[PDB]
Amino acid sequence: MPIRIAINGTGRIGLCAIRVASQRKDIEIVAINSTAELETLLHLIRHDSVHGHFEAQLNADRTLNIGHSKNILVLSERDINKLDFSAANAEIIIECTGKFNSLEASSAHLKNSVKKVIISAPAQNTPTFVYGVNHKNYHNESVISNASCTTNASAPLLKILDEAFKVENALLTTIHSYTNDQNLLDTKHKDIRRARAAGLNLIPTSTGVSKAISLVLPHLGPKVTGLAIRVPTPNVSLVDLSLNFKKSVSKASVQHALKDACKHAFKGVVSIDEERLVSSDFISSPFSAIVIDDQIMTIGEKNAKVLAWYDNEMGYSERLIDMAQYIAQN
Amino acid sequence: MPIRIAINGTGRIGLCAIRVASQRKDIEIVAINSTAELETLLHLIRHDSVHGHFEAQLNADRTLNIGHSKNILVLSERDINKLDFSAANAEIIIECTGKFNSLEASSAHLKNSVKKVIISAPAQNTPTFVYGVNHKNYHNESVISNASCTTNASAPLLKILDEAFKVENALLTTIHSYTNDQNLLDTKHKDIRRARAAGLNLIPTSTGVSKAISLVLPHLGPKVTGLAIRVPTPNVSLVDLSLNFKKSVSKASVQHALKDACKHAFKGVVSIDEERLVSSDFISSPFSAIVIDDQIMTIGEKNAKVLAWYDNEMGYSERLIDMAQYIAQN
Amino acid sequence: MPIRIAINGTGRIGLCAIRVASQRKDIEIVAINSTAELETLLHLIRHDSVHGHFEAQLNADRTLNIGHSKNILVLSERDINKLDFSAANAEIIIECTGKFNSLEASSAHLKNSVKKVIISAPAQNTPTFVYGVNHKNYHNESVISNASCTTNASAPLLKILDEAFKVENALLTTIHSYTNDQNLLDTKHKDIRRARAAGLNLIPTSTGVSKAISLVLPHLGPKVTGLAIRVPTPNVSLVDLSLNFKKSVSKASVQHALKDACKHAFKGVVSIDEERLVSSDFISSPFSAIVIDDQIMTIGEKNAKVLAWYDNEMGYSERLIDMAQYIAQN
Amino acid sequence: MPIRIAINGTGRIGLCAIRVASQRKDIEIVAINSTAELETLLHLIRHDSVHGHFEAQLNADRTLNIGHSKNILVLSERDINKLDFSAANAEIIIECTGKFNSLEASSAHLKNSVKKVIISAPAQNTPTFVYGVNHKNYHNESVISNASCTTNASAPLLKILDEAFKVENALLTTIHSYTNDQNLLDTKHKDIRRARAAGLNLIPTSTGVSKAISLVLPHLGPKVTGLAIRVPTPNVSLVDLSLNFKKSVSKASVQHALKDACKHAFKGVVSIDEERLVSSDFISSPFSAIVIDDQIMTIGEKNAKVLAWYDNEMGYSERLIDMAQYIAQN
Ligand SMILES: NC(=O)c1ccc[n+]([C@@H]2O[C@H](COP(=O)([O-])OP(=O)(O)OC[C@H]3O[C@@H](n4cnc5c(N)ncnc54)[C@H](OP(=O)(O)O)[C@@H]3O)[C@@H](O)[C@H]2O)c1
Ligand SMILES: NC(=O)c1ccc[n+]([C@@H]2O[C@H](COP(=O)([O-])OP(=O)(O)OC[C@H]3O[C@@H](n4cnc5c(N)ncnc54)[C@H](OP(=O)(O)O)[C@@H]3O)[C@@H](O)[C@H]2O)c1
Ligand SMILES: NC(=O)c1ccc[n+]([C@@H]2O[C@H](COP(=O)([O-])OP(=O)(O)OC[C@H]3O[C@@H](n4cnc5c(N)ncnc54)[C@H](OP(=O)(O)O)[C@@H]3O)[C@@H](O)[C@H]2O)c1
Ligand SMILES: NC(=O)c1ccc[n+]([C@@H]2O[C@H](COP(=O)([O-])OP(=O)(O)OC[C@H]3O[C@@H](n4cnc5c(N)ncnc54)[C@H](OP(=O)(O)O)[C@@H]3O)[C@@H](O)[C@H]2O)c1
Known part of the structure; x- marks a missing residue:
């Protein structure tokens, strides 16, 4: 079954992560948390001043449909403690807000169905991996950083x-x-x-x-x-x-x-x-x-x-x- | 005696208002409220990517000295209700934050020594004047807008x-x-x-x-x-x-x-x-x-x-x- | 048979005209005159800071191959009187240099196989047509302008x-x-x-x-x-x-x-x-x-x-x- | 007496050299050769998108008046062999065109009153000096480069x-x-x-x-x-x-x-x-x-x-x- 991810934060990196993940057949984006209004989120995914245009649709139930991810739940909760990805059964959070770049802060995501967090930035006290460099040293850590x-x-x-x-x-x-x-x-x-x-x-x-x-x-x-x-x-x-x-x-x-x-x-x-x-x-x-x-x-x-x-x-x-x-x- | 003003907010318009006011012999800037650190405020006054360099100094008592305004008290209080210009005896506030653009909001400045407020933007429910257009119709209103x-x-x-x-x-x-x-x-x-x-x-x-x-x-x-x-x-x-x-x-x-x-x-x-x-x-x-x-x-x-x-x-x-x-x- | 065109001048408009024409099944670009070296011309066709990347190849005989135009002869002659599109049997010249924007100047192209010229700019004394506006008034003029x-x-x-x-x-x-x-x-x-x-x-x-x-x-x-x-x-x-x-x-x-x-x-x-x-x-x-x-x-x-x-x-x-x-x- | 210089070429470096030289009491700019029209040259000296505004005037006899250089003859001759600074009695040419960056090419300036040439760029076969680095090694060479x-x-x-x-x-x-x-x-x-x-x-x-x-x-x-x-x-x-x-x-x-x-x-x-x-x-x-x-x-x-x-x-x-x-x- 495709890996169930959720993207937290929809600025530059979150938007790019959505687009990338949507093209991976082994991934399912099951949820996105955005501080934008739904229609604005869709607009930002679709139209990029630098990267051009991208296909994305709104389903009848107001989930998003992008590439291989046909049923994306859209959330809007800034408070990480109130945020709840349960209805989507997310397993891995891609943390892209820039506001929780520490082990302690991003560990707040570890609840309910969530197993792991990858932070889109250097993060204090956090195991850090770069793909092709040291990623094979990964040893089941639940919160990691992808460095800069x-x-x-x-x-x-x-x-x-x-x-x-x-x-x-x-x-x-x-x-x-x-x-x-x-x-x-x-x-x-x-x-x-x-x-x-x-x-x-x-x-x-x-x-x-x-x-x-x-x-x-x-x-x-x-x-x-x-x-x-x-x-x-x-x-x-x-x-x-x-x-x-x-x-x-x-x-x-x-x-x-x-x-x-x-x-x-x-x-x-x-x-x-x-x-x-x-x-x-x-x-x-x-x-x-x-x-x-x-x-x-x-x-x-x-x-x-x-x-x-x-x-x-x-x-x-x-x-x-x-x-x-x-x-x-x- | 020079007119005692205070500048609230030090983004683009507040910085420009400081520089302008400093060159007016009939004005005294008695205080500036800035969310920047003091040294950063001084730096921003002095060095502008568009407008060039400006002379400004820090006095021994850590007031600023700029042009005709030789004793400017620097405050740093975002909360308009806690903000207090009393130690400077400000009479007119130049409201430049963009966050109080209404009659009700900017009326919070009317306390202590403060007599009048001029808002640096269109403002809801606020008497609006443009110099040379309708300013002579001013009739002692305590909160006004300078339009866009x-x-x-x-x-x-x-x-x-x-x-x-x-x-x-x-x-x-x-x-x-x-x-x-x-x-x-x-x-x-x-x-x-x-x-x-x-x-x-x-x-x-x-x-x-x-x-x-x-x-x-x-x-x-x-x-x-x-x-x-x-x-x-x-x-x-x-x-x-x-x-x-x-x-x-x-x-x-x-x-x-x-x-x-x-x-x-x-x-x-x-x-x-x-x-x-x-x-x-x-x-x-x-x-x-x-x-x-x-x-x-x-x-x-x-x-x-x-x-x-x-x-x-x-x-x-x-x-x-x-x-x-x-x-x-x- | 596809319409045999040649593009004169390979700046912004000529490059864009090449790319556009290459995608039209009813057109054959039979020649391009460029002041660039061949490899530089190919490079400019392929890679555009604004428009992105485009497929284009060099054939074994050093003609270009772009879209439906598989055999494009590349010339390099600034002097319009020496320039000769005969080896390519061009019938219509798309004049994109900016240097012959007049009836008299562009009429120098009318020799050998060439029947018609379209000038990529307003042109002195030249019949001017805008597609969808007055193009149906065309009446077999041999040199026309496409306006600005x-x-x-x-x-x-x-x-x-x-x-x-x-x-x-x-x-x-x-x-x-x-x-x-x-x-x-x-x-x-x-x-x-x-x-x-x-x-x-x-x-x-x-x-x-x-x-x-x-x-x-x-x-x-x-x-x-x-x-x-x-x-x-x-x-x-x-x-x-x-x-x-x-x-x-x-x-x-x-x-x-x-x-x-x-x-x-x-x-x-x-x-x-x-x-x-x-x-x-x-x-x-x-x-x-x-x-x-x-x-x-x-x-x-x-x-x-x-x-x-x-x-x-x-x-x-x-x-x-x-x-x-x-x-x-x- | 001030050193009599002429500036050849009025692009970026020539314009800047004019402004700099105009402020040196030991220099007299006696002539400028420009491919611009006189009024356009004056306009470019006066108004710079990056450097701001500069005072410069046209005298009654249509020489320029800039700083300490009150009588600047304006020439307009692209051909270095026809160009003649004699009416101004220029002694040193500041060569700023970018078109004569060689010993042989800039040596064409050495005629009439002209004693020396300084080329505003690296120049083939030309003695090169950088102020503060090796300029004291200068030994009366008539054509030199100021490097990049x-x-x-x-x-x-x-x-x-x-x-x-x-x-x-x-x-x-x-x-x-x-x-x-x-x-x-x-x-x-x-x-x-x-x-x-x-x-x-x-x-x-x-x-x-x-x-x-x-x-x-x-x-x-x-x-x-x-x-x-x-x-x-x-x-x-x-x-x-x-x-x-x-x-x-x-x-x-x-x-x-x-x-x-x-x-x-x-x-x-x-x-x-x-x-x-x-x-x-x-x-x-x-x-x-x-x-x-x-x-x-x-x-x-x-x-x-x-x-x-x-x-x-x-x-x-x-x-x-x-x-x-x-x-x-x-
Ligand atoms: N080249 C890059 O851009 C790059 C590359 C690698 C890594 N990074 C890192 O990735 C992180 C994000 O950078 P970015 O460039 O994407 O920044 P960005 O464009 O500013 O996007 C961050 C977004 O997070 C949102 N946000 C903030 N707090 C939130 C919350 N609690 N819940 C949900 N959304 C929230 C912000 O929305 P609001 O404005 O509504 O708060 C903003 O749209 C930073 O740590 C950065 O260093 C960036
Ligand atoms: N051309 C112009 O720029 C122009 C012309 C005329 C009028 N205006 C108007 O003037 C207003 C300000 O515009 P601007 O261009 O100067 O914006 P700006 O550069 O964003 O500056 C506003 C500044 O206010 C600060 N600020 C916000 N809340 C504050 C508070 N409670 N106390 C103190 N400082 C606070 C912000 O700091 P933080 O980031 O720390 O919050 C920011 O540095 C807007 O209403 C705008 O429409 C602008
Ligand atoms: N938005 C637009 O750009 C636009 C739109 C519609 C119409 N136009 C018009 O189309 C014309 C071309 O504009 P452009 O923007 O494409 O200009 P450009 O980018 O400057 O391109 C013109 C090209 O023509 C070349 N050229 C000059 N004389 C030549 C000759 N005798 N033979 C071959 N090539 C020669 C130049 O090369 P060298 O540097 O080697 O001389 C240059 O690369 C102008 O009249 C313009 O007004 C432009
Ligand atoms: N940062 C810099 O810009 C910099 C710094 C140090 C050195 N340099 C060097 O200084 C030289 C000039 O650079 P630049 O940046 O000033 O170039 P630029 O802005 O292009 O100016 C050169 C000017 O020379 C004119 N010119 C050309 N041939 C001429 C002639 N025979 N007689 C009179 N004027 C003529 C050109 O006018 P037309 O268009 O009418 O031909 C043009 O306006 C170059 O060798 C450059 O490498 C530049």
């Missing part, structure tokens, strides 16, 4: 390149699309750079590179650090890794190592672009990272720069649902 | 052109910069077009043209209607009036009527651009409307199109403080 | 509404995406507003409304005028008609007149949006105009505002190829 | 950090505003990524890091490489250096080394931002590089990431005029 979109792009690359050449240290920059955490126009924010108009500025902002890699690749965590620069694009981001290796490298040898991994251990997760594409070309791409083959470069015997694209909404959401399928069966 | 930025641009023009040529009917479109009411990326909104990414789309949205003009120009209210189109610019808007008159008009005669008004009854309020400028050129302009002289056109004997720029933040904020000065002395 | 994208949106609407209610006068504004005629950053231009950065500004610019309507709807030409405002979107535009009629109108009656026309005389040309969409939703739409049903409004007995979307690249290009099919058979 | 804006930002930083810690290798990424070399919408370009719409995409593009550093810091040239990512901002860029040193470093020690250099050998050239600003805050900044103090980071004993802002138009133009003053007196 940047960690999903960078951890595969670090694992591949460490296995090939042995990472001594690396520095990461992500040139990253703006998100709904940012401000349209200059106004209060906890981060005084994210305070500033997102569409007008280059905005350096921390990202917890060292700590994230430490969770999924413990040996590499102390060896890497980095930051983000938010820029005026609405979706698709670019990780830029500057690496120092133990083994000597060339542009060609780095290219070959990455291509080999895409054929083998990272098939479906990492890809290679040899066509000289730009960010908009990767809208809706399902990969965690798409290496920019022609821009790989080396200097000295031991250093390389590797860039890779990722659709920070869709690649991540594909991984969320990959992880739901994995933890249900393992 | 679009009404401040369009009502002067309608009054001028009606006086000259007699408006039979008019249709208004504003091509308007995005605001913080909009969404960065597609997500819930009460208005399903304002739901959609502000930086990516042309977004038709109602604006209550008929009702606003009815308040400030009662005879014209039943004769005009219109709408807004939000577009991907961060500031500066453009009103487009399509008018049908009783008297015959030419491009020249419309031009002359508008220019004459700028010399006389609308001096300092309406201006004329003869230099073929574009929207960015009007950042920080203090006028309610800047007519685009060369783009005036007529068709038939009786119809004209008139365009005018306005800085929807700064022109409006200049008027807010003009109105504070007026109601304090009248 | 704005005329293709506005002339259908004016014809519909005139037939229903009798236009006395109308004023048009188009809120229009930027085009490659504009400047990325402030620099020389013949139009000192189009000189200014396209992505940063609202840019009023003439458009020859009166003269265009005069060509296709002679009785209405003296009754209408208007202008354009270029804004920071890359594609999709919005026409805003403010009309004064002889017959009395209501919002409902205008809505009904437009809907009826879409079912009948403007089927496939004009459509109606009842779903409260925004500009990005109309990317790649084939219609000349998509009326915004909910934003129709009236004031007084005789005046209405009507808005309609159009994809200024794709709707226009669909019409270009519609006109090629029509003039080949008529 | 990125080299002006990165070479000071590399020199400072090499002197302090000894660079073993470095990798550079510049997150760079779009320029007029790019395309508004997807169309032909020699670089198939720069072909794609500048305002819509992240666009990786080569930049000749290794070769440039080799010219100005020969010992470091073989040790560094990198690339650019063009993004949707109109001005202000960010260099991101990932460095491996011989000496051990900390965040603090890197911070201190950079701050010390700004007080001493790079005063007026490199600055430090301790105020957590964003890109728009550096519009019109005169520095070659503004280090982002709080975002410096280290990993391992030997690696650091250093970011720095630069206004790619204005910082560079300040250096152009600094170099004109230097080569005139040395």
Whole structure:
């Protein structure tokens, strides 16, 4: 029987998770909790400024019908303690609100029929897994984190390149699309750079590179650090890794190592672009990272720069649902 | 003695009102209520992605020092009933939060030293005045509205052109910069077009043209209607009036009527651009409307199109403080 | 046999015309003249920042293979007098360069196998036709113009509404995406507003409304005028008609007149949006105009505002190829 | 007597060079060659979408009057062989067209009164100098290059950090505003990524890091490489250096080394931002590089990431005029 999931929260990631899950024959979306009105939820699923149009219908009983998920119950309850997925018999919650990113907070979902929660973000005190990196270490934990979109792009690359050449240290920059955490126009924010108009500025902002890699690749965590620069694009981001290796490298040898991994251990997760594409070309791409083959470069015997694209909404959401399928069966 | 004002709310309009008021020798900003931390408030006053840099300092006692307002008390209380401007002896509140846009709601400010409130938006059941249009009809009301930025641009023009040529009917479109009411990326909104990414789309949205003009120009209210189109610019808007008159008009005669008004009854309020400028050129302009002289056109004997720029933040904020000065002395 | 066309010029309109024509079973694109290198042309056909990805292949003999056009000869000759489509046996040229927009200039294509030219723009001294408006008046002219994208949106609407209610006068504004005629950053231009950065500004610019309507709807030409405002979107535009009629109108009656026309005389040309969409939703739409049903409004007995979307690249290009099919058979 | 310069070409860099030079009491702009009409040139000098408004006047004899340059002759001759600055007695040409970036091409300016040329770009076979890096090695060469804006930002930083810690290798990424070399919408370009719409995409593009550093810091040239990512901002860029040193470093020690250099050998050239600003805050900044103090980071004993802002138009133009003053007196 298809795995019975519910999506909590219908902003960018929840909307993308709905669309992704609707296309998976082994999944059934049995419920969605949204703070939007039903008709507005349907409208947002159907029409996306970046990703285009999507088929979705309202059944006669006012459940939704999307892809393989023909009977989706729509809820609207912000209070996680009042929220009740029982009428839908949900087993796995995809937690996409941004408001319960901790073990303690998301553990409130564990009641009634619900067995497991996957949090769409780094989460305090929560077992963290990245598909293709450390997901096989999963051991029946009931609440897990799928890390960040940047960690999903960078951890595969670090694992591949460490296995090939042995990472001594690396520095990461992500040139990253703006998100709904940012401000349209200059106004209060906890981060005084994210305070500033997102569409007008280059905005350096921390990202917890060292700590994230430490969770999924413990040996590499102390060896890497980095930051983000938010820029005026609405979706698709670019990780830029500057690496120092133990083994000597060339542009060609780095290219070959990455291509080999895409054929083998990272098939479906990492890809290679040899066509000289730009960010908009990767809208809706399902990969965690798409290496920019022609821009790989080396200097000295031991250093390389590797860039890779990722659709920070869709690649991540594909991984969320990959992880739901994995933890249900393992 | 300078008029003692306090600014409630420090988003776009509150920040602009602070800067404007700081430059008026007849005003003293005695307090600001902000949900930002003090250092963040100071940072936002000083550095604006659109308007540039502004001088502002922190005094030794942690009041702010800005222009002619050398001793500004900073408060941080969201609850209007707990908020207390007494230590600053504020007399007029400039209400800029967007959360108390009604007579009943803003009347909560009327306590202690506070005599009057000016609301930075249309407000339910509230006496509404536009400077240069109907402000001389003010009659000591304690809570008033300064209408919208679009009404401040369009009502002067309608009054001028009606006086000259007699408006039979008019249709208004504003091509308007995005605001913080909009969404960065597609997500819930009460208005399903304002739901959609502000930086990516042309977004038709109602604006209550008929009702606003009815308040400030009662005879014209039943004769005009219109709408807004939000577009991907961060500031500066453009009103487009399509008018049908009783008297015959030419491009020249419309031009002359508008220019004459700028010399006389609308001096300092309406201006004329003869230099073929574009929207960015009007950042920080203090006028309610800047007519685009060369783009005036007529068709038939009786119809004209008139365009005018306005800085929807700064022109409006200049008027807010003009109105504070007026109601304090009248 | 399919109609043998060649596309001259591969900028925005030429690229779109290629894609459109490739999907028409009654057309064969037998040649393309491009100033790009072959591989770059193929790349531009395949990958579009706005319109997404398109299938296109290089045959073993280095002709292109796109849709129903399996053997497209690629030329690269800027000089219209040296350019020779003979090896491809082209019969109709779709002239998309922007550099030969006159009867005299485009008449240089009339040699060898070429019978007819359709110019992708208003053109001096050239018979002008808009599909659904006056195309049935075509009378075997060898060089014609397909007018502008704005005329293709506005002339259908004016014809519909005139037939229903009798236009006395109308004023048009188009809120229009930027085009490659504009400047990325402030620099020389013949139009000192189009000189200014396209992505940063609202840019009023003439458009020859009166003269265009005069060509296709002679009785209405003296009754209408208007202008354009270029804004920071890359594609999709919005026409805003403010009309004064002889017959009395209501919002409902205008809505009904437009809907009826879409079912009948403007089927496939004009459509109606009842779903409260925004500009990005109309990317790649084939219609000349998509009326915004909910934003129709009236004031007084005789005046209405009507808005309609159009994809200024794709709707226009669909019409270009519609006109090629029509003039080949008529 | 003030140094008599002429500016050849009035796009972004030429316009900025005019404005900069006009404010230098030791310079006289005696002529400008522009392909714009005189009134359009004046308009572009006066009104800038990014940099704001500038005072400039037309004298009675139709020379320009700007700052300290009260009698500027305006020419309009594209052909460098016909162009003649004799009536103005120009001694130094600031070559800003982008069309003569070679020793051979720019040597055509050396005639009549002209003694020296400074090219606003890397130039083939041309002695290259960066102010504060290697300009004191100037030895009366008549045609020189001022390198690129990125080299002006990165070479000071590399020199400072090499002197302090000894660079073993470095990798550079510049997150760079779009320029007029790019395309508004997807169309032909020699670089198939720069072909794609500048305002819509992240666009990786080569930049000749290794070769440039080799010219100005020969010992470091073989040790560094990198690339650019063009993004949707109109001005202000960010260099991101990932460095491996011989000496051990900390965040603090890197911070201190950079701050010390700004007080001493790079005063007026490199600055430090301790105020957590964003890109728009550096519009019109005169520095070659503004280090982002709080975002410096280290990993391992030997690696650091250093970011720095630069206004790619204005910082560079300040250096152009600094170099004109230097080569005139040395
Ligand atoms: N690229 C990305 O966007 C990306 C990638 C990976 C992970 N993430 C992470 O995923 C999380 C969500 O990000 P997002 O970009 O999707 O944010 P978003 O667009 O702001 O969406 C979050 C949504 O959650 C809703 N919500 C808040 N509290 C709720 C509640 N108690 N019950 C139901 N709905 C509630 C909000 O609605 P209201 O406005 O009504 O409160 C909002 O629409 C964040 O932690 C983020 O860091 C984002
Ligand atoms: N062009 C314009 O922007 C324009 C022109 C004329 C009039 N208006 C009107 O003016 C109002 C404000 O607009 P805006 O553009 O300035 O909005 P904004 O940028 O969103 O600013 C509003 C600010 O109010 C703060 N706030 C909310 N509740 C508060 C409270 N109880 N006490 C103190 N601060 C509080 C918000 O902070 P939190 O996020 O912490 O809640 C926010 O920073 C709206 O009614 C708008 O329609 C705007
Ligand atoms: N929305 C629209 O974009 C739109 C809609 C309707 C009509 N139009 C009209 O259609 C025309 C083309 O507009 P567009 O937007 O497609 O412009 P565009 O993107 O600038 O494309 C024009 C292309 O023509 C090429 N070209 C110039 N001279 C040529 C020659 N002699 N032979 C071959 N190719 C040549 C140019 O290449 P080089 O750079 O190598 O010269 C350029 O790539 C204009 O008249 C425009 O007004 C445009
Ligand atoms: N950030 C920057 O923008 C930056 C920084 C440092 C260096 N640079 C370099 O400086 C150069 C200029 O760049 P830019 O950004 O200023 O380019 P731009 O904005 O395109 O300006 C170049 C100008 O040169 C004019 N021109 C071309 N040939 C001419 C001639 N023979 N005589 C007179 N004027 C002529 C062009 O006018 P027409 O269109 O009429 O031909 C155009 O307005 C390039 O080599 C660039 O790499 C740029």
